[PDB]
Ligand binder design. Structure first.
Ligand SMILES: CN1C(=O)CN=C(c2ccccc2)c2cc(Cl)ccc21
Ligand SMILES: CN1C(=O)CN=C(c2ccccc2)c2cc(Cl)ccc21
Lengths: 116, 52
């Protein structure tokens, strides 16, 4: 529940205006902070095994999602200055591509790990 | 990076020498620190000349 909530927290950056640069950067990087702290405090339950579990993969993909959201805003801020025709409809694409990708990941993950 | 190092530094014994993972964390910290310092340097020269 908290990692998914932090992913939706990173998602809310897309509806914020593209001109407020410190707002979106601070939101993304503080969301990255929260993901790291939650991941570290969550791995202290299980032993020091060297293989990937079904819990490491989930938090790893959540971190990747937050990383991708921040790097997407970074490329957005570079592209509004380089050429605006490509950066106008990128955020509107992200607003629908990020939740569908995360929901598809959740469906495939939960079925693949509850079938085993 | 400080939070990451802290977690690993507050889980191992007090040995005086520098480990390999400590060297990797110090290298990563020096890279992020140098990125912040280059930002300071590009914020300093921006008013005198933005070409540099
Ligand atoms: C220390 N740490 C983080 O900072 C957040 N992302 C990482 C990670 C992120 C991407 C790939 C591999 C590893 C992670 C994963 C676990 Cl299972 C526990 C702590 C943790
Ligand atoms: C042992 N060490 C240093 O001497 C360089 N400065 C520190 C520092 C600076 C501020 C707070 C905590 C630690 C640091 C940070 C990392 Cl992520 C890895 C190694 C390391």
């Amino acid at each position: 529940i908290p990692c998914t909530l932090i992913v939706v927290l990173s998602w809310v950056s897309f509806w914020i205006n593209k001109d407020a640069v410190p707002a979106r950067t601070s939101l993304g990087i503080t969301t990255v902070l929260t993901m790291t702290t939650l991941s570290t405090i969550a791995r202290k339950s299980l032993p020091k095994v060297s293989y990937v579990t079904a819990m490491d993969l989930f938090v790893s993909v959540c971190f990747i999602f937050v990383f991708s959201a921040l790097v997407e805003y970074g490329t957005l801020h570079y592209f509004v200055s380089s050429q605006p025709a490509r950066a106008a409809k990128m955020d509107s694409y992200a607003r629908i591509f990020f939740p569908t990708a995360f929901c598809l990941f959740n469906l495939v993950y939960w079925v693949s790990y509850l079938y085993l | 990076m400080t939070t990451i190092n802290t977690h690993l530094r507050e889980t191992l014994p007090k040995i005086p020498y520098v480990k390999a993972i400590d060297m990797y964390l110090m290298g990563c910290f020096v890279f992020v620190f140098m990125a912040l310092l280059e930002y300071a340097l590009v914020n300093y020269i921006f008013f005198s000349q933005p070409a540099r």
